[PDB]
Structure formats: C-alpha cells, structure tokens
Amino acid sequence: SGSMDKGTLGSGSKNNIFYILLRDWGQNEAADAMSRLARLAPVYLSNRG
Amino acid sequence: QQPMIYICGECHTENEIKSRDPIRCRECGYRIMYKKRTKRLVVFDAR
Amino acid sequence: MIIPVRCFTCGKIVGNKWEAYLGLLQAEYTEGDALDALGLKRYCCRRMLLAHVDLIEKLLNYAPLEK
Amino acid sequence: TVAVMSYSGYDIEDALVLNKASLDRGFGRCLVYKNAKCTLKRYTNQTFDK
Ligand SMILES: [Zn+2]
Ligand SMILES: [Zn+2]
C-alpha cells in the first residue's frame, strides 16, 4: 500500500528504502537497486508524458 | 623568381614588392596591403 | 546571413522562395498573405522567411570591388 | 521549436536535449576568429631581422 513520495525514497531523510536495505542486508545490494530504479522510472515517465 | 603579388585596400591594384622597399602603393597613398589566395587545391567536407 | 536552403526542424526546402517572398511583399500584400500564397501552411517552416535578417546585403558594400 | 516535457534521462536539473537532424541541418553553427600579429623592427646599430 501507499505511493512513493519525497519522505520514503528522498535524499536527506530517515526510514528510507535504500537506507533500510543497506542496514538490514549488505551495502552491495543497496547500490545495485539504486540504478535499477533510474532505468525503470524515467523511460515509463517519458512514454507516459 | 615571380615577384610576390600584393593587393591594396583602397584601389585594389596588384603590385609587387622588390626588396626592402617602403611598404606603400604606387597609385594611392595608402600604406596597407593585402595578400592573394593560394593557388593550391584544398579539400573540404560537405557533412 | 543568407536564407537557409532547408528547414531546421522538418527539412523542407525554404531557400527557393526568399526572392519571391521579397517580390510579393511589394505588391500590397500582407505578410500572412504572402506566407499562405507561397505555399507555407505550417509554422515550423514559416518563420524561416518571416523572421529572417539580411546582412550579406550590408556586407557587400564593404566587400572588395575592382577599379 | 521547444517541447516542454521530460525525455528519457537527459533533461536533469539544467540539461537540454537537441535534435541531431536539426544540428546537421545547421541550427546553431558558430565561428571563432583568432588574431595573430607580429611586429618586427630595427635596432640602434645596423642589425636587422629577416
Ligand atoms: Zn592602392
Ligand atoms: Zn519546416
């Protein structure tokens, strides 16, 4: 449930997706999932308008 | 060999400078001269 | 300086109507009348002739001329 | 002609996207002119330059 906003995956905030991912699991898994979003969101936004 | 041809900027007359001469024009009193374009073949790109 | 031969966006030849556009602006024609009589219908290939300055005409007065 | 919309990935904070066809047609052609001047003189003696 919920929509992703500036407080969930934003820069300069706690309770972050990548932050919790790096705290729970290893730090290598946090960087591999940061570039996957930058390849999924922008193309869909460009094709949406 | 061939005298170096130079053009003026007021009368555009093609004269020649022989050797260590006062740089001027023989028609007018203008003291600046120009040069001719080279007679070689330069290649250009149309891209 | 000179009217572009082709358009920037689409690529339609717009450089063959500059002199015709000039000669048609002196027959008591409106800018829009000349632009829609020449053949231009859309606006991407219309501002090539409308908004264009001619500086080569002023640059030929300073050009070297033979005596 | 400008189209205010996001593109694939290259309009980040101030980046702008160009059109390759328009750039080839000649949108934004620039020319640079540099000057190279050289003066040459005599001296108080009879020495010279050549
Ligand atoms: Zn002269
Ligand atoms: Zn056009």
From Swiss-Prot, chain A:
Where does the entry say this protein is expressed, by tissue? Expressed in the brain, in the cortex and the white matter (at protein level).
Residues spanning the signal sequence: none
**Which residues are in coiled coils?**
none
The subcellular location is: Nucleus; Cytoplasm, Cytosol
Q: Which disease is it linked to?
A: Leukodystrophy, hypomyelinating, 7, with or without oligodontia and/or hypogonadotropic hypogonadism: An autosomal recessive neurodegenerative disorder characterized by childhood onset of progressive motor decline manifest as spasticity, ataxia, tremor, and cerebellar signs, as well as mild cognitive regression. Other features may include hypodontia or oligodontia and hypogonadotropic hypogonadism. There is considerable inter- and intrafamilial variability. Wiedemann-Rautenstrauch syndrome: An autosomal recessive, neonatal progeroid disorder characterized by intrauterine growth retardation, failure to thrive, short stature, hypotonia, variable mental impairment, and a progeroid appearance. Clinical features include apparent macrocephaly, sparse hair, prominent scalp veins, entropion, greatly widened anterior fontanelles, malar hypoplasia, and generalized lipoatrophy. Death usually occurs in early childhood but survival to third decade has been reported.
Which family does the entry's similarity section mention?
Answer: Belongs to the RNA polymerase beta' chain family.
Q: What is this protein called?
A: DNA-directed RNA polymerase III subunit RPC1
Q: Which organism is it from?
A: Homo sapiens
Q: What is the lineage of its organism?
A: Eukaryota, Metazoa, Chordata, Craniata, Vertebrata
State the covered range within the intact protein.
647 to 695 of 1390
Curated annotation (Swiss-Prot), chain B:
UniProt keywords, alphabetically: DNA-directed RNA polymerase, Metal-binding, Nucleus, Transcription, Zinc, Zinc-finger
- Chief subcellular location equals nucleus
| Transmembrane portions of the chain | none
Q: Where are the zinc fingers (C4-type)?
A: 8-28
Query: What are the GO cellular component annotations?
Result: cytosol; nucleoplasm; nucleus; RNA polymerase I complex; RNA polymerase II, core complex; RNA polymerase III complex
UniProt entry tagged with the keyword Metal-binding: yes
Where is Zn(2+) annotated to bind? 8, 11, 25, 28
Q: Where found?
A: Nucleus; Nucleus, Nucleolus
Q: Which GO terms describe its biological process?
A: regulation of transcription by RNA polymerase I; transcription by RNA polymerase II; transcription by RNA polymerase III
- Kindly indicate whether the keyword Nucleus belongs to this entry: yes
UniProt GO MF annotations: DNA binding; DNA-directed RNA polymerase activity; zinc ion binding
The record's subunit annotation is:
Component of the RNA polymerase I (Pol I), RNA polymerase II (Pol II) and RNA polymerase III (Pol III) complexes consisting of at least 13, 12 and 17 subunits, respectively. Pol I complex consists of a ten-subunit catalytic core composed of POLR1A/RPA1, POLR1B/RPA2, POLR1C/RPAC1, POLR1D/RPAC2, POLR1H/RPA12, POLR2E/RPABC1, POLR2F/RPABC2, POLR2H/RPABC3, POLR2K/RPABC4 and POLR2L/RPABC5; a mobile stalk subunit POLR1F/RPA43 protruding from the core and additional subunits homologous to general transcription factors POLR1E/RPA49 and POLR1G/RPA34.
Query: What family does the Swiss-Prot or TrEMBL record give for this protein?
Result: Belongs to the archaeal Rpo12/eukaryotic RPC10 RNA polymerase subunit family.
Name of the protein = DNA-directed RNA polymerases I, II, and III subunit RPABC4
- Organism, scientific name: Homo sapiens (Human)
Question: Taxonomic classification, please?
Answer: Eukaryota, Metazoa, Chordata, Craniata, Vertebrata
Swiss-Prot record, chain D:
Task: Classify the source by domain of life.
Answer: Eukaryota
Q: Could you list the residue ranges that cross the membrane?
A: none
Q: Where in the cell is it found?
A: Nucleus; Cytoplasm, Cytosol
- Which residues hold Mg(2+)? 14
The record describes its quaternary structure and partners as: Component of the RNA polymerase III (Pol III) complex consisting of 17 subunits: a ten-subunit catalytic core composed of POLR3A/RPC1, POLR3B/RPC2, POLR1C/RPAC1, POLR1D/RPAC2, POLR3K/RPC10, POLR2E/RPABC1, POLR2F/RPABC2, POLR2H/RPABC3, POLR2K/RPABC4 and POLR2L/RPABC5; a mobile stalk composed of two subunits POLR3H/RPC8 and CRCP/RPC9, protruding from the core and functioning primarily in transcription initiation; and additional subunits homologous to general transcription factors of the RNA polymerase II machinery, POLR3C/RPC3-POLR3F/RPC6-POLR3G/RPC7 heterotrimer required for transcription initiation and POLR3D/RPC4-POLR3E/RPC5 heterodimer involved in both transcription initiation and termination.
Summarize the protein's role.
Catalytic core component of RNA polymerase III (Pol III), a DNA-dependent RNA polymerase which synthesizes small non-coding RNAs using the four ribonucleoside triphosphates as substrates. Synthesizes 5S rRNA, snRNAs, tRNAs and miRNAs from at least 500 distinct genomic loci. Pol III-mediated transcription cycle proceeds through transcription initiation, transcription elongation and transcription termination stages. During transcription initiation, Pol III is recruited to DNA promoters type I, II or III with the help of general transcription factors and other specific initiation factors.
| Family stated for the protein in its record | Belongs to the RNA polymerase beta chain family.
* Annotated protein name in UniProt: DNA-directed RNA polymerase III subunit RPC2
Q: Which organism is it from?
A: Homo sapiens
- Its gene is POLR3B
